[PDB]
Swiss-Prot record, chains A, B:
This is Tuberculosinyl adenosine transferase. Its cofactor is Mg(2+). The keyword Repeat does not apply. It is an enzyme of class 2 (transferase). The lineage of its organism: Bacteria, Bacillati, Actinomycetota, Actinomycetes, Mycobacteriales.
Length: 289, 289
């Protein structure tokens, strides 16, 4: 269990990997769907929906219980009117399309939505329809317990929301809410800290307030989210589960004088080595090294 | 100004780089001091203090206005009693040592402290001394306006703190606090979102609640924080300022059929390329690729 080689891990059947993940984690994984337009212009609503389902299905079939997936951020008013409509149409799909609803039922997925969407969403018919669809879905899938899916819609800044939720909670309860109750209030249900975040391109994380910690393993694929392969996910999983927090930890004092020199050389050999710096090609940033 | 080459940027005098940063940013930079014991066991309280000052001085002399530096996290009770004492002694240095106090006065630095240190700090003499020292320093350097320095002591989970701060604010004010007021309450003064985070080793961020956004450029050096060189910082600065958000943005539609193929190849050439996966050597994780 604690002694599986990366090669074996990569050769293992899906049901075997899932069992390992159910026991070792990650329990909660953040996976935003970025670089969609780019992916489309290389390989719309019905195409992205399929890929989203593919990846989401992939994540859940690997044992991951909860998936936090940011889909819409405030940077949505940075585009025309046709975007708003098209956007709300995509949001509607998440709660109305038959193939995805079957996905929730097939894999018993409880869908929840977080963010400042109720306020920031265009105060109009189509917008209210989405909100109602979101609430409806959340309750519809309440019976599902195998997996939890959290969609981020304007879920980048929780400060004000937490503040107002705490004030109301204190007014009706008589005491301030616990961290647990604060999280249930934002995500609609309790969710453990994120164990990993899988982004792409520029090194940056976003849209998963209150669930971040120094223990959230970060990963940045070179290609867009939808390009995620089976091999890539397993390599990410393996790294997090067996490599990030290695044990027994290092004992500097008990090491020989040579081991220390070899270690020091690993750092001073390339004294200015940095991960995060990139280069631009056609306006697109690519990580170096 | 908007057309400086990386080479020139690297050749430019310090006062020139600072001027560019004062105009283009980053305005707020997160720089935690990690891998200290490791650095020490390769090159204690008086040694780390010097390096911390070196780097802090480096950051400020490059134009950075605010530096958020996490120094102590809850993972402090993961060690013996001698650690607690030694730790509170280091904390005391930040507010009592003469060379660092001169540093604040020399570079006009306003020092602030954030985190759940008032509660979690050992309810004892030495602990209360630190807390008082912290409050004292914060007020002592209130006249300084050139730079702002925020030290993170148990500043990983702000949820409960924000909740209680909002309840009290609403009770005395009659209305909930704004995001701005919520941030002033946690950090003791208003601070803009973090423009970049410079970590090391394992890809992960931490201890800068409420100040994170998708625009927080992440960087992970291979060697410990104290190994930070002049060249490395400039390469990081340059990347953030001129490369992260390149402009004009890309126009897929207006590109030739070949440019699109070259771009697609940049992604499918190495289909499973991932940044964040590593390898272990002597219990120490090192990023691959
Ligand atoms: C945020 C966004 C585009 C921003 O695009 P970048 O993230 O900026 O990528 P780039 O830089 O390559 O253009 C729109 C989301 C989108 C594509 C989502 C994506 C997942 C869920 C689903 C419901 C399938 C859906 C349906 C249609 C809808 C328009
Ligand atoms: C958090 C901590 C050690 C954890 O060490 P890792 O971050 O775990 O590094 P590793 O893994 O290599 O052991 C103690 C902080 C330390 C070294 C700080 C560091 C900056 C500020 C200053 C005041 C100079 C100070 C004085 C003395 C004090 C003990």
């Amino acid at each position: 269990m604690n002694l599986v080689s990366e090669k074996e891990f990569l050769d293992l059947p899906l049901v075997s990997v899932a069992e390992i993940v159910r026991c070792r984690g990650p329990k909660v994984s953040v996976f935003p769907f970025d670089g969609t337009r780019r992916w489309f212009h290389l390989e719309f609503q019905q195409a992205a929906l399929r890929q989203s389902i593919r990846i989401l299905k992939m994540l859940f079939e690997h044992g991951i219980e909860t998936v936090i997936s940011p889909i819409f951020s405030d940077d949505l008013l940075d585009r025309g009117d046709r975007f708003i409509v098209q956007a709300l149409e995509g949001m509607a799909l998440l709660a109305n399309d038959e193939e995805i609803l079957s996905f929730y039922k097939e894999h018993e997925v409880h869908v929840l939505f977080y963010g400042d969407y109720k306020k920031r969403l265009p105060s109009t018919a189509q917008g209210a329809a989405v909100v109602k669809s979101f609430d409806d879905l959340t309750i519809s899938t309440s019976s599902n317990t195998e997996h939890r899916l959290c969609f981020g819609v304007f879920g980048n800044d929780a400060a004000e929301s937490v503040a107002q939720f705490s004030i109301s909670w204190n007014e009706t309860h008589g005491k301030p809410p616990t961290r647990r109750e604060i999280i249930e209030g934002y995500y609609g249900e309790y969710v453990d800290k994120a164990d990993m975040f899988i982004g792409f391109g520029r090194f940056s994380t976003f849209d998963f307030p209150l669930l971040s910690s120094g223990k959230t393993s970060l990963y940045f694929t070179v290609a867009p989210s939808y390009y995620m392969t089976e091999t890539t996910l397993r390599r990410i999983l393996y790294d997090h589960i067996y490599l990030r927090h290695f044990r027994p930890k290092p004992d500097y004092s008990a090491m020989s004088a040579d081991q220390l020199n070899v270690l020091r050389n690993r750092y001073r050999a390339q004294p200015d080595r940095v991960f995060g710096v990139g280069c631009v090609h056609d306006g697109i940033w690519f990580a170096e090294g």
